[PDB]
Design a protein around this ligand. Structure first.
Ligand SMILES: Nc1nc2ccc([C@@H]3CCC[C@H]3C(=O)O)cc2s1
Length: 165
C-alpha cells in the first residue's frame, strides 16, 4: 500500500521516492511511464522502468508499435506492468524543447482519468523540458482520479511542496 505520501488536493498525493522502488513495493494496478511516441525507453523514467523489467517492457513495446503504429503526442496505450504493476499506462507528454505544444500536456494528463488509482511521475518534466512546477499545476487542474506522484529529486520535491501547500 501507498505509504508516506502528502495529500496536496482531494485527489493528488506526492512523495519523494524513486518510482521504480515504489512500484516494486506497492505493485499498483497502474504505473505510468513518461514515454515517447515510438515507446523507445532509452533514458529518464522510461529507461529506469524498462531496466527494472530487464528489457521485457521494451520487447513488448516494439511488438505494440509493429502492430499499431506510434502513439500521438498527448496520447497513451495500456500494456503489461510486468513485475512493477498489473498494467503500465505509457503516456506521451510534449517535448517542448523540440517545439511540441505545451497545450498537449493537458491532453497527456487526461489519459490518467481512465484509471481510478495510478502511481506516476511528472509528465514532460525530464528531458522533455517543461517546468516541473507547471507540470504539477496541469496535473492538479486536469486529473480527477487518484494519482500518487513519485518525485525522485529531493530539491525538486521540496520546491513542489512549498508551492502547492
Ligand atoms: N529511477 C528513476 N529514474 C528517474 C528519472 C527521472 C525521474 C523524474 C522525471 C521527471 C522528474 C524526475 C524526478 O522525479 O526527479 C524519476 C526517476 S525514478
Amino acid at each position: 500500500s501507498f505509504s508516506g505520501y502528502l495529500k496536496l488536493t482531494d485527489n493528488v498525493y506526492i512523495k519523494n521516492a524513486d518510482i521504480v522502488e515504489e512500484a516494486k513495493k506497492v505493485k499498483p494496478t497502474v504505473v505510468v511511464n513518461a514515454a515517447n511516441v515510438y515507446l523507445k525507453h532509452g533514458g529518464g523514467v522510461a529507461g529506469a522502468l524498462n531496466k527494472a523489467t530487464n528489457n521485457a517492457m521494451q520487447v513488448e513495446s516494439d511488438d505494440y508499435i509493429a502492430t499499431n503504429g506510434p502513439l500521438k503526442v498527448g496520447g497513451s496505450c495500456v500494456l503489461s506492468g510486468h513485475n512493477l504493476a498489473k498494467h503500465c499506462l505509457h503516456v506521451v507528454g510534449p517535448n517542448v524543447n523540440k517545439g511540441e505544444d505545451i497545450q498537449l500536456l493537458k491532453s497527456a494528463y487526461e489519459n490518467f482519468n481512465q484509471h481510478e488509482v495510478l502511481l506516476a511521475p511528472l509528465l514532460s518534466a525530464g528531458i522533455f523540458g517543461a517546468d516541473p512546477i507547471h507540470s504539477l499545476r496541469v496535473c492538479v487542474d486536469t486529473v480527477r482520479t487518484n494519482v500518487y506522484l513519485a518525485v525522485f529529486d529531493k530539491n525538486l520535491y521540496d520546491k513542489l511542496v512549498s508551492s502547492f501547500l
